[PDB]
Amino acid sequence: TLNGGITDMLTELANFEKNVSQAIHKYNAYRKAASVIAKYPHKIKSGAEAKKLPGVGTKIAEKIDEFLATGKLRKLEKIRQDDTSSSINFLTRVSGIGPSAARKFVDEGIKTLEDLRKNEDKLNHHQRIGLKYFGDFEKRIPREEMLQMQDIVLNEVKKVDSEYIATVCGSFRRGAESSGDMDVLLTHPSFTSESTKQPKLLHQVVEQLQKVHFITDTLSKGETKFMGVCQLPSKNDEKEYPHRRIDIRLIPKDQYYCGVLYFTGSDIFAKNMRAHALEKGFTINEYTIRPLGVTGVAGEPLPVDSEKDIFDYIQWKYREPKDRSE
DNA sequence: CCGACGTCGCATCAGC
DNA sequence: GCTGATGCGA
DNA sequence: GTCGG
Ligand SMILES: Cc1cn([C@H]2C[C@H](O)[C@@H](COP(=O)(O)NP(=O)(O)OP(=O)(O)O)O2)c(=O)[nH]c1=O
Ligand SMILES: [Mn+2]
Ligand SMILES: [Mn+2]
Ligand code: NA
Ligand code: NA
């Protein structure tokens, strides 16, 4: 954490441009610069040194100079005491609330935590639940708790159909000592790129995980993606565990490796990999890696049978999950 | 300079 | 009801 | 905001 103050500054700038300015690319530029600096093994002595890194240009270099000299950045000081910006930035932290909904909520005077509670009738379902567990969602999950949840999910899954395979991707698979949520890839042999030989495949798993009071809430649900809330069971006389966000993704069994690559992350690592795939003339999603034609239009799925195979096509040495934490 | 910036799932709304 | 765009999220 | 070309 050598360059902690800097990466925080850029991350805060990223949040600003996303939530307030609604400038998504600026937001990704800051997050990209913060990431490349995050894994820079030196304590940066000057902006020009940082400018030697990709994703770090003139404007950020100048801001880094200002930060390194004063210990602060004036643009952020101004933003911090801007009440509208501070209000919008806050509302966006509630799940289901983005820059647009936050901005309009502020136009109605709804700009604090109680504002959201007394005006509960103005939220859709996602925002209602996202506010219901705002406090709990702020807490991280120690890896120890992640391990408990994986036993439950994997065993409950086993009980519905023993051919379900369930893998816990996300930062957990990246070996993080603490995660922000739980991410689960799911594969049943009846669901391939060829056919859905069984309906309700994901529904029945959600159903089972609700029966055991593991999944307490749903933010959204489809035939391939679930977004909701879970909770570890506490013993007698114990304070309850915080409610945890959970994501479940049903991906066609034969397209597992593109799926496990996608959901393992990190999100930036992905964005850099897929952007590199393009420069090599490939396009990767959670399903397939495919070549790009002479006209841009992608061709047929190339054969993939390992995580490493996808790294090969784009001329990248395989990086274990632990090393994708950009 | 400038075009492009990973890719896609669900909720939701506009328009028909 | 559907198609496509938009908002928010993975 | 950055950068390839
Ligand atoms: C949010 C998000 C996720 N993803 C992919 C990569 C993430 O690793 C994976 C899971 O989403 P997440 O749980 O929001 N990210 P996380 O598991 O990497 O980090 P954390 O430990 O939950 O905070 O999905 C993207 O590719 N773009 C995104 O914007
Ligand atoms: Mn996660
Ligand atoms: Mn997640
Ligand atoms: Na640079
Ligand atoms: Na949000």
Q: Which residues lie near ion ligand 2 (Cβ < 5 Å)?
A: A 170, 181, 183
Q: What is the resolution of this structure in A?
A: 2.8
Cα–Cα distance measured from residue A314 to residue A303, given in angstroms and rounded to the nearest whole number: 14
Cα angle A149, A131, A262 (rounded to 5 degrees) comes to 50
CATH of domain A140-262: 3.30.460.10
Q: How far is the CA of A91 from the centre of ligand 5 (A)?
A: 7
| Domain locations along chain A | 1-82, 83-139, 140-262, 263-325
Same fold: A1-82 with A83-139? yes
Domain A263-325 has CATH 3.40.50.720: no
* CATH match of A1-82 with 3.40.920.10: no
CA of A270 to C1' of C3 (A): 31
Neighbour-count burial for A16-46, b at 16+ CB within 10 Å, e otherwise? bbbbbeeeeeebbbbbbbbbbbbebeeebee
Angstrom CA distances, A37 to A40, A51, A135, A242, A303, stand at 5, 10, 31, 33, 35
Nearest residue, CA→C1' of C6: A100
CA of A23: nearest nucleotide by C1' is D1
Which candidate in A18, A63, A111, A253 is catalytic? A63
Q: What number does CATH give the domain A83-139?
A: 1.10.150.20
Ligand 4 centroid to Cα of residue A16, in Å, is 22
Active site residue A159: no
| A102-136 per-residue burial string, b: 16 or more CB within 10 A, e: under 16 | bbebbeeebbeeebbeeeeeebeebbbbbbbbeee
**Contact in structure between A34 and A4 (CB atoms under 8 Å):** no
Report which bound ligand comes closest to the CA of A88.
5
